[PDB]
Scaffold this active site. Sequence first.
Site, PDB file in Angstrom:
ATOM      1  N   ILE A 363      26.378  40.217  65.361  1.00 44.31           N
ATOM      2  CA  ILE A 363      27.705  40.264  65.326  1.00 44.31           C
ATOM      3  C   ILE A 363      28.447  41.029  65.886  1.00 44.31           C
ATOM      4  O   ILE A 363      29.541  40.968  66.439  1.00 44.31           O
ATOM      5  CB  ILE A 363      28.095  39.823  64.117  1.00 44.31           C
ATOM      6  CG1 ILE A 363      28.198  41.097  63.254  1.00 44.31           C
ATOM      7  CG2 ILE A 363      27.451  38.725  63.197  1.00 44.31           C
ATOM      8  CD1 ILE A 363      28.370  41.002  61.775  1.00 44.31           C
ATOM      9  N   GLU A 365      28.085  44.808  68.698  1.00 42.91           N
ATOM     10  CA  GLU A 365      27.497  45.649  69.446  1.00 42.91           C
ATOM     11  C   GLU A 365      27.768  47.252  69.626  1.00 42.91           C
ATOM     12  O   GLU A 365      28.625  47.553  70.200  1.00 42.91           O
ATOM     13  CB  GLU A 365      27.069  45.072  70.992  1.00 42.91           C
ATOM     14  CG  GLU A 365      26.014  44.081  71.202  1.00 42.91           C
ATOM     15  CD  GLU A 365      25.905  43.577  72.504  1.00 42.91           C
ATOM     16  OE1 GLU A 365      26.876  43.358  73.416  1.00 42.91           O
ATOM     17  OE2 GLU A 365      24.931  43.138  72.953  1.00 42.91           O
ATOM     18  N   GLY A 366      27.104  48.163  68.964  1.00 44.35           N
ATOM     19  CA  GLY A 366      27.379  49.419  68.836  1.00 44.35           C
ATOM     20  C   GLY A 366      26.784  50.281  70.130  1.00 44.35           C
ATOM     21  O   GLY A 366      26.107  49.755  70.949  1.00 44.35           O
ATOM     22  N   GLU A 435      29.318  45.428  53.133  1.00 44.67           N
ATOM     23  CA  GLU A 435      29.848  44.171  52.717  1.00 44.67           C
ATOM     24  C   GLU A 435      30.195  43.305  54.099  1.00 44.67           C
ATOM     25  O   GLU A 435      30.323  44.096  55.060  1.00 44.67           O
ATOM     26  CB  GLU A 435      31.146  44.225  52.053  1.00 44.67           C
ATOM     27  CG  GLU A 435      32.271  44.296  52.828  1.00 44.67           C
ATOM     28  CD  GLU A 435      33.411  44.997  51.835  1.00 44.67           C
ATOM     29  OE1 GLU A 435      34.511  44.995  52.300  1.00 44.67           O
ATOM     30  OE2 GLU A 435      33.125  44.802  50.818  1.00 44.67           O
ATOM     31  N   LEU A 436      30.194  41.975  54.256  1.00 41.77           N
ATOM     32  CA  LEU A 436      30.288  41.069  55.233  1.00 41.77           C
ATOM     33  C   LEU A 436      31.724  40.661  55.356  1.00 41.77           C
ATOM     34  O   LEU A 436      32.188  39.702  54.616  1.00 41.77           O
ATOM     35  CB  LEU A 436      29.299  40.124  55.584  1.00 41.77           C
ATOM     36  CG  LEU A 436      29.366  39.178  56.611  1.00 41.77           C
ATOM     37  CD1 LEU A 436      29.438  39.783  57.983  1.00 41.77           C
ATOM     38  CD2 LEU A 436      28.272  38.043  56.717  1.00 41.77           C
ATOM     39  N   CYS A 437      32.715  41.126  56.299  1.00 39.08           N
ATOM     40  CA  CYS A 437      34.028  40.444  56.331  1.00 39.08           C
ATOM     41  C   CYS A 437      33.921  39.119  57.143  1.00 39.08           C
ATOM     42  O   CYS A 437      34.019  39.212  58.442  1.00 39.08           O
ATOM     43  CB  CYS A 437      35.026  41.534  56.933  1.00 39.08           C
ATOM     44  SG  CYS A 437      34.867  43.045  56.004  1.00 39.08           S
ATOM     45  N   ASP A 481      40.240  56.626  65.636  1.00 41.42           N
ATOM     46  CA  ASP A 481      39.945  55.387  66.106  1.00 41.42           C
ATOM     47  C   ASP A 481      40.517  54.077  65.588  1.00 41.42           C
ATOM     48  O   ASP A 481      39.946  53.135  65.263  1.00 41.42           O
ATOM     49  CB  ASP A 481      38.636  55.129  66.744  1.00 41.42           C
ATOM     50  CG  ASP A 481      38.475  54.091  67.877  1.00 41.42           C
ATOM     51  OD1 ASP A 481      37.462  53.666  68.117  1.00 41.42           O
ATOM     52  OD2 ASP A 481      39.564  53.884  68.355  1.00 41.42           O
TER      53      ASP A 481
HETATM   54  C1  LIG Z   1      34.665  46.207  67.724  1.00 37.29           C
HETATM   55  N1  LIG Z   1      34.691  45.373  66.770  1.00 37.29           N
HETATM   56  C2  LIG Z   1      33.416  45.085  66.298  1.00 37.29           C
HETATM   57  C3  LIG Z   1      33.230  43.764  65.889  1.00 37.29           C
HETATM   58  C4  LIG Z   1      31.748  43.635  65.329  1.00 37.29           C
HETATM   59  O1  LIG Z   1      30.937  44.482  65.470  1.00 37.29           O
HETATM   60  C5  LIG Z   1      31.470  46.086  64.907  1.00 37.29           C
HETATM   61  C6  LIG Z   1      30.775  46.940  65.974  1.00 37.29           C
HETATM   62  C7  LIG Z   1      33.004  46.241  65.315  1.00 37.29           C
HETATM   63  O2  LIG Z   1      33.671  45.921  64.038  1.00 37.29           O
HETATM   64  C8  LIG Z   1      34.096  46.906  63.438  1.00 37.29           C
HETATM   65  N2  LIG Z   1      31.044  46.350  63.682  1.00 37.29           N
HETATM   66  C9  LIG Z   1      30.899  47.787  62.950  1.00 37.29           C
HETATM   67  C10 LIG Z   1      30.770  48.816  63.816  1.00 37.29           C
HETATM   68  C11 LIG Z   1      30.314  49.849  63.043  1.00 37.29           C
HETATM   69  C12 LIG Z   1      30.345  49.834  61.408  1.00 37.29           C
HETATM   70  C13 LIG Z   1      30.552  48.634  60.906  1.00 37.29           C
HETATM   71  C14 LIG Z   1      30.877  47.529  61.652  1.00 37.29           C
HETATM   72  C15 LIG Z   1      30.895  46.071  61.338  1.00 37.29           C
HETATM   73  C16 LIG Z   1      31.077  45.539  60.289  1.00 37.29           C
HETATM   74  C17 LIG Z   1      31.376  44.125  60.140  1.00 37.29           C
HETATM   75  C18 LIG Z   1      31.500  43.231  61.459  1.00 37.29           C
HETATM   76  C19 LIG Z   1      31.835  42.139  61.827  1.00 37.29           C
HETATM   77  C20 LIG Z   1      32.070  42.005  63.097  1.00 37.29           C
HETATM   78  N3  LIG Z   1      31.740  43.516  63.815  1.00 37.29           N
HETATM   79  C21 LIG Z   1      31.442  44.190  62.661  1.00 37.29           C
HETATM   80  C22 LIG Z   1      31.252  45.325  62.545  1.00 37.29           C
HETATM   81  C23 LIG Z   1      32.307  40.816  64.020  1.00 37.29           C
HETATM   82  C24 LIG Z   1      32.120  39.669  63.357  1.00 37.29           C
HETATM   83  C25 LIG Z   1      32.774  39.864  61.757  1.00 37.29           C
HETATM   84  C26 LIG Z   1      32.161  40.930  60.959  1.00 37.29           C
HETATM   85  C27 LIG Z   1      31.456  43.885  58.926  1.00 37.29           C
HETATM   86  O3  LIG Z   1      31.589  42.542  58.624  1.00 37.29           O
HETATM   87  N4  LIG Z   1      31.152  44.666  58.142  1.00 37.29           N
HETATM   88  C28 LIG Z   1      31.090  46.123  58.819  1.00 37.29           C
END
Ligand SMILES: CN[C@@H]1C[C@H]2O[C@@](C)([C@@H]1OC)n1c3ccccc3c3c4c(c5c6c(n2c5c31)CCCC6)C(=O)NC4
Length: 611
Positions: A363, A365-366, A435-437, A481
């Site tokens: 979901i 990409e870090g 947790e998953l948003c 950020d």
């Molecule tokens: C730039 N937006 C990205 C969207 C995606 O992936 C990232 C990299 C980023 O969201 C913060 N992401 C994280 C990065 C570092 C720590 C936690 C999260 C993270 C998190 C979630 C998340 C989700 C998405 N992304 C998530 C997350 C896209 C689809 C919905 C859920 C999440 O639901 N819990 C942590």
Amino acid sequence: RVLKVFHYFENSSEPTTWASIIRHGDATDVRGIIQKIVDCHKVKNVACYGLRLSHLQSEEVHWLHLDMGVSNVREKFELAHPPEEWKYELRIRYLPKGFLNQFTEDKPTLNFFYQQVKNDYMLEIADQVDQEIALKLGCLEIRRSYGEMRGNALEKKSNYEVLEKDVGLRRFFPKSLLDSVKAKTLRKLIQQTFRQFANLNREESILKFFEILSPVYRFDKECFKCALGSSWIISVELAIGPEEGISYLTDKGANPTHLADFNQVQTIQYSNSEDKDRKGMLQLKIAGAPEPLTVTAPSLTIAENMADLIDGYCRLVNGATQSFIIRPTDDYAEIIDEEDTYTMPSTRDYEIQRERIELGRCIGEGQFGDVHQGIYMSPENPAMAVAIKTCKNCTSDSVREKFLQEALTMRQFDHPHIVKLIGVITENPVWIIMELCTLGELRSFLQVRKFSLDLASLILYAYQLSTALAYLESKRFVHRDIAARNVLVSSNDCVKLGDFGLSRYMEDLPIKWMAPESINFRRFTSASDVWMFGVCMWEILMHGVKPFQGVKNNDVIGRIENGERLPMPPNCPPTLYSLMTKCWAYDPSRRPRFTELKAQLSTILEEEKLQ
Ligand SMILES: CN[C@@H]1C[C@H]2O[C@@](C)([C@@H]1OC)n1c3ccccc3c3c4c(c5c6c(n2c5c31)CCCC6)C(=O)NC4
């Protein structure tokens, strides 16, 4: 063993702590150490480097010869004082004949060398250099170090107050200058003497630095107080440098005197004084002249040092690799890193077994690793939808530690609008469970609901956020950020602040969201978080539009530097915009605290709900 070698290859840490940590195999020599370090940094002019060793309580110094093996070196010195009171530093000792020009084509070296000289300037003569000088040189470093800050930046009270009151002017100017003169006055001087250095790029600042400095500090040659002569002895200051060879003088001011060019030294020899005192006896043989030119040093140690120097120069002036000094499997040299304090206590409590996670789809990409969605099955409880953050290059031992540092911080947080940490899996490949948003990223969510999201829900998000930020502000944590991209929506009426990861090292950018001091001076505080929250509210109020669409990145810096601000969004109440613009107060100390924004948004909320 290993062993910490201090050096001058720039890095965005406090300069004192610039080293490499090298594990050596037994009969590995000084050459070997040096050879690895400079190759980390793509160095061309490798011959110019040497390795110096110094005690800390005493100011004597030892130059370690290439061939001398590290092992026998540690043993023979560290047979007196602990490895803790010994400091090893790589330095540039043997300069080629047009060295500044030369180094212009060897960027890492020219940098290393600048960093080297500055330091000696700061330590040896800055505190009694002429005063327009300290000013200029100080200015040059300012100009160099902040290569992204607009030339007129220091005409703003508050920009200077970042340098003075936050970074520290002691970083650029000597102690005496600062306390000898009134703060208010000093401000102005610095302001004026920077005018001229305003448009210089990095390389140019360095060259100007040298050009200004040399006439009053001679980093091009090394001088020695020593007696010359055979059985007949006279008294001089020996001078060794690439541009003159070997001179002496006594005089007063008038001319020095040549002795010998490096291309003439047949052999180098050093004994203790074969007579009364253990004075340093150095025995240079010169092409033609049957008299071995004798030099008398105040100690053998100094003799050793001078020998090194000349020897270094001969091995240079001639393409040679090996010594001009008379002689009376296992070159392992891996560059490693840190031995840090362990991860704080600690996981036993939020440990998750990998068999209790089904890793579903990707979901996010870090940089250091992907974010997947998944199922978590705590058997005492039912299945759970989770976010799983995974580590890419997992077994880079300290990459793992910096990774699950993030999990440690997240552990301390408990707040309705910050994404919960569920657990960790600390075994390679390390995962972090959160947790998953479900409704995902804020921007997209807004964009899609641009015509079905009332103004009230919009300010709700803003509020929800501010509470999260206040919570964090209270726990003295800077996010760095804040943007809609970083905010997830767990529910139609609920957003959560996400992320909390590391971006080290250093590195080198969401400009269009950044507080100007972040852009100029690289400071990130709670105030810059308020700035960025400002932009974030705008984003929200613009239903996920990007600030400055179709605007180039140095176009934005100037706009803002001048006075421009993002326009009042369509159907945004005028108070809230008033509230945004406060966040975009240029001078940090004028922006509100989150605790104050919380309070405003709260009431802007109620008013707007009843009207
Ligand atoms: C730039 N937006 C990205 C969207 C995606 O992936 C990232 C990299 C980023 O969201 C913060 N992401 C994280 C990065 C570092 C720590 C936690 C999260 C993270 C998190 C979630 C998340 C989700 C998405 N992304 C998530 C997350 C896209 C689809 C919905 C859920 C999440 O639901 N819990 C942590």
